[PDB]
Amino acid sequence: MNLEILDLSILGFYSLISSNSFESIAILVATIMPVITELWYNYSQLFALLYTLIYVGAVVILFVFILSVINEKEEYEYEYSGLFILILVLLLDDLDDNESNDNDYNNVYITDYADWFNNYNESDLSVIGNLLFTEYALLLLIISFILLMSIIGLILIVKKD
Amino acid sequence: MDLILLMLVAVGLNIIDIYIMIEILIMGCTVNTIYSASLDNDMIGLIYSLIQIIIAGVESAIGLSILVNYNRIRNSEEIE
Amino acid sequence: PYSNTRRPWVLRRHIIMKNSPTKWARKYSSRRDEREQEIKDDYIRGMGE
Amino acid sequence: METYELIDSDPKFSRVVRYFRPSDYLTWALGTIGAPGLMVLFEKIEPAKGNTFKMPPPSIMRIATTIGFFGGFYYAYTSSTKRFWGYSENAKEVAKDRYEVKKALSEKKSPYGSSLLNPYQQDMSARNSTNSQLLLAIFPWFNVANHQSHGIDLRKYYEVRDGEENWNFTLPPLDQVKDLDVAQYKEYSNYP
Amino acid sequence: PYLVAFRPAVLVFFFIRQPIGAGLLAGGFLFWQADRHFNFGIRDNIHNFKQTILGFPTQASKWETFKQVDAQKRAQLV
Amino acid sequence: QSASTLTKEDVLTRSVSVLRGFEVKTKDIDLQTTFVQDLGMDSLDLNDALVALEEEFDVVFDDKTANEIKTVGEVVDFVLANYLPTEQSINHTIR
Amino acid sequence: MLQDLFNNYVILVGILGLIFLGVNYFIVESPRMDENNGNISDYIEKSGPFECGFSSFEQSHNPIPIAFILVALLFLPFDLEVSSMLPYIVSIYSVGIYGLIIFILFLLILIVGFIYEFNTKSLSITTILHKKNKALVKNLY
Amino acid sequence: MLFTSLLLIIVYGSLVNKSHLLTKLINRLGLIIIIYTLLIHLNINTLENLSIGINMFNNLLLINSFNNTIIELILIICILYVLLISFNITGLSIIDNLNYSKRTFIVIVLFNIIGLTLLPLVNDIMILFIIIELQSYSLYLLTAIFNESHNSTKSALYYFIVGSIASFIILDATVSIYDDLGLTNIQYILMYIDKLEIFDLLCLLFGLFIKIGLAPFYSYSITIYSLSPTIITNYISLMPKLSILTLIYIIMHYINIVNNTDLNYVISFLILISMFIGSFGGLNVIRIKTLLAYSSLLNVSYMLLAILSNSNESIIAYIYYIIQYSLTHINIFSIILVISIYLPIMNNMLNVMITKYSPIEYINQLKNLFINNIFIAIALCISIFSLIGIPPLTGFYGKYLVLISGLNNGYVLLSIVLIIASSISTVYYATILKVLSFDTLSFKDIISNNLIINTSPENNNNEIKPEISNVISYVISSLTLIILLIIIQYENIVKGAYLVLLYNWV
Amino acid sequence: APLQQVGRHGGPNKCFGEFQRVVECMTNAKHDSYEPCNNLKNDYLECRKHKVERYKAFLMQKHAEELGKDPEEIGAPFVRKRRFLTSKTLGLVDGDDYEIGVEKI
Amino acid sequence: SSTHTNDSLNSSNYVDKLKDTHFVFENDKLPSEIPDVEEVGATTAPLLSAAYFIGAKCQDYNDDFMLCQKEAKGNGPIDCLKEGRRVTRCASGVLKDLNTHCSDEFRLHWQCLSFSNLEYKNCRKAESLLNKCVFEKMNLVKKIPGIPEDRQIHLKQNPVLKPVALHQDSEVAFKKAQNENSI
């Protein structure tokens, strides 16, 4: 039983019924956690950890803004929905989870063959840094330039002075 | 269910809820990049994934500051 | 070890994360899969030569 | 197109500055004083405050001189680069280039120089820096490495041209010149 | 890996707060797992219906192409 | 959005109904209808009506106007000139 | 590398957290065994917010001004800069001097942001009151 | 030069004290920086050498003679725009002090110019995404430079949200292509141009269409341009189009290799709708900037027909059209900024409220310009007639060259529709001219001492005091005469556009 | 020429050689048209997704069903749980069916 | 490196569940036309202990097998089967000679590697005894190419990095040779 399917089923239910802004900042965290875990267990543990290191800091800053802008509006308001229309919507959605229509690509299993030629064996992050700091160093230096612009941009927007 | 734009009901009714949708939508692009790069054993895709994460975090800050100053403008009397 | 190569569940089941112009094309538009089925059919047709 | 002889498809930073003509230094000075001078001209054209002329403050003239100093060097750097590329007349630079390379070859030294970079990094550095002067107006990037990807064949330095007999350089074969690719991979084909 | 630690906490609290919404969501989840495990084929047939109606090459469509080539090739020899 | 949608006929109509729920001498209320004479309100009854007409239209009479008000038409004039919709959150308008 | 032992630990941590809630739930005496003041739902005098004894305005959903919001926003650009050094940490030897110079250039461009924040005093606290000393003067005649 | 001088200006601006004069002088330093950038770029980049196409920075960038011309055009128009913030537009402090109150105004412009010039050069999907973010972020920061303005901040919020959705669409398109091919460099992807899904590139174009305000995504740009200050609206309504349209041309140049007519039909559908909305949209409007927003949507539809046809005649059409339309755009906004000095002052029905950011906000605030300043009114008439396409103004040859490329490629419907669209949009172009001049005789002998210009003092009553400042007057004079007298040099200018090649060669 | 398809250890990955032979073919000056490099393009795309090879496995599985062949009699033996890669399955002389240790190497 | 791949065992059985991994066997032998060869039967610790003696004995065959791979031009695993069989036999010859000539010295060294995370720096003493025994009986010298003979790390007198835990058997066997051989 792939229990990640159940997790996304609950998350989709709570995204349809979410009312206030605090629930939305919880839908975000309830989305990154399935992403981080599935990356950890299937494809990339490096990027599972990079997601946690960067998105959490963004989440708390996002949460602190909710405190300064919460404006009483959706606590006392009413929503109608209907339990039957919610579950029927989620049932129809769950029916079609085939993002791709290449049946052979989705059904036939493949393998790779290992070789011993790579005797200098290092992590993916060392190769990523090796290329990023040598061949795509321009991409890194532009990213540094964009980060500098954000620093100036945030000040010229928020600072009253 | 996607073609009838069911995602328009899943987005909350605050401006910040639109920000979260944008982050989730961009995060879908990065997960697709990581998935393809790992299958191909290609580090160029992972370099792309790292760039997307950093850039997506930049616009999150720039958009937040605009929303922060927008709220300050409403609370402008500040007689205190 | 023989394993599937399918996209993560969160990619193809999240209510919001699964929606994009190219994801809808891959899922609902047969234009891409019509072309790639021609390549597979050529493999069996060309056996006789 | 009035093309000329290609000297170096990616000239090193030191070579570009050394090969500055007296006019290149003249334009460097013009850029340096052209920026404060334009601030005076703009005030003369239309005063910043009111209707009367006012000399801009010394702090503005200080930062203006610095901006012009960098702008003057970038112009002079691109002026000298065209001669290496062959886009501009470079007869003097060819004679100077041939003397320096033949002198280094006779000493069994690399015309390009020894590098701290391994074979990959020399190749990677040339990929990053070659033709980068076309965007020197936007952001800077210079060749400050001793790589071998200069777009030239060193065999053309083994034919004596007019006005080079008095140099009397005895050139060894290319496989005896230190720190060249054709004299580096002796024992292993993947290690220099 | 944090979903493995949080999943028992979220699931029990989900049933406590919304027992009917949780039972319906969990009941549907188990039903499709029974479809896959016991080869009921309900999800596969829906997939085969979607591809047929949207013009995709179905599993039967690709097998029909093979059978058309197979009959064509045999006569080319006979 | 942040502008009034009030007409003179609606404000008068809503004013009459709110004044009908009180103990007034006559139910026939128009613009010229005075509070003291036609409806018969003493000091305290009049201010009960003013606050009742405040809550209906979400307006607040100033002290100078409230002490000097005589007729029903004066109230309708005041509501039309001073009514503003209440400011909404940063999300109600743009979303 | 095998992480099956790590998987069992994460499972135990998740179960262990629910044990504290459950054990406290099964151990506490039922309210009828206590003073018997009913279920906690009815006892609103107990479930109300703490305000040091005196009730006040219920301002839970009102907005709260935040004086360090600019610093909080600038945390994100600097957090990304710190996370950008991770590729260099594990590849410092391979990139050699070329990567080291690029690493410095990455930091030198970001140091202009540090100079900018210092000179603009953007990392201060945004007070709304300001204490200024007025001078007493006499318009004599 | 741009990058190096930006760092010095960033630090210098934060060091010296804050005063309007210092910010104005720092803006003039920005003017010198762009001039030096143009001189350095001209000194090294030449049309003849770049015809082949030269790779730079590990093939991340690719500059050719088609890219180079747009870069120089961007630098030239940016020079003209900085004159607005570096000199007096009106000469009255209540209006002009706005352009000097933000010290980061020039810094953001230099940030955006770098993004504008690099975007047409992108040769990799990774750098395409990075640069399109760099250009977009600077536009958001410029839209919000006046953070004490409620409308300016509201526009920046709308701009950020819509432009982030487009960027995600652009990123999603590149991720799909990388998933198909496992390649990131454009020239490598061209080797597999026949096997990747070509509609993955239409998704890339769709995100670019949002950023240029094409229909059906036109709504946000019309809203943003009207709410933003006139100085901000002048920049953001023109600058993104110079770079993105050039990039769209290069992408469509690669798409035409496989000749997918289904993709050509979808784009033709977007052009057809944009002509209908651009022409009929402006008929019932009262704001001048809302009117110009529809004019921008209409002229983009004309250029996209040349981009869609994508042939040898299309290079000449697009190159000439983009140059002459930028000058007309600059000329009109320069006049609109100047003529706020002729606004009457009260001493009232409809309760019309005018702010300091946009003193000229309604079309009928241009009334009696034929009386107040005949030379400026004629200059505005010449520009509006150029947008109409009255020969022999520059706008006529723009439509003529667009039609040639469109009809040469068999786009019969779009050529007819645009000519109908031109006639429909003439109705609201003529309404500007009707407001300027048509009441001249019935108002010539009236006493108008209630203008904004009358609040200015007089020096000696024996001197001659010009009513408009020197620099802004010379720019309007120069651009208007270029628009009017292009017939003299049209043959030589179009021969130059013949030489601009995009892998034509032979 | 920038590097593409770089393996996790910094060298060329499985499909780099296919990509390299495509670039060499497309950029060779001896070719009048790009027709000679069409088979090299399919080989590179087959290296990544194996779509034609998966399609062949689809035919073999389907063709075996219609002739009544048993999937477990014509396929390859497999084990789904790593703990049960036992010495008896591996064929060792003193093999056993007891689970193997996978908790900590 | 703990990256999940499709060519070997992954980190945990949750990775197998997500990938639906099947661990597949093939009961068919190599075709009878290909000559048979007995595989090398040593595990990780013995192979690392014997790595530099296999290099000093099979250098010609190791290089010839690798040079065959380069000249194969993609057709590698097929065209170098004959060269590969020579490599396997030569490596087995070294392991055979170790177990007959230097059995106690050899088993001492790779039992220390198993005791010490398979790090060469932790087992210098047992390595020195094995090097001395192999050189006397097989005339094999461990050499690290590319560096001077006197800068080889395994011959360093006072290394900076030393094992925290001492292998007791190696300490005992080192003392015995000290008092009996270097008098």
Ligand SMILES: CCCCCCCCCCCCCCCCCC(=O)OC[C@H](COP(=O)(O)OCCN)OC(=O)CCCCCCCCCCCCCCCCC
């Ligand atoms: C250690 C476990 C921590 C979580 C245990 C509690 C389980 C509750 C749900 C957790 C997350 C499941 C998905 C929910 C997404 C957010 C939606 C939401 O609004 O929260 C649900 C919660 C229930 O409120 P309810 O009364 O049922 O609905 C409103 C009725 N008008 O309304 C609330 O506002 C309460 C939320 C409390 C704060 C939760 C913060 C999010 C924590 C997520 C961490 C785990 C990540 C998600 C894993 C499960 C994925 C489905």
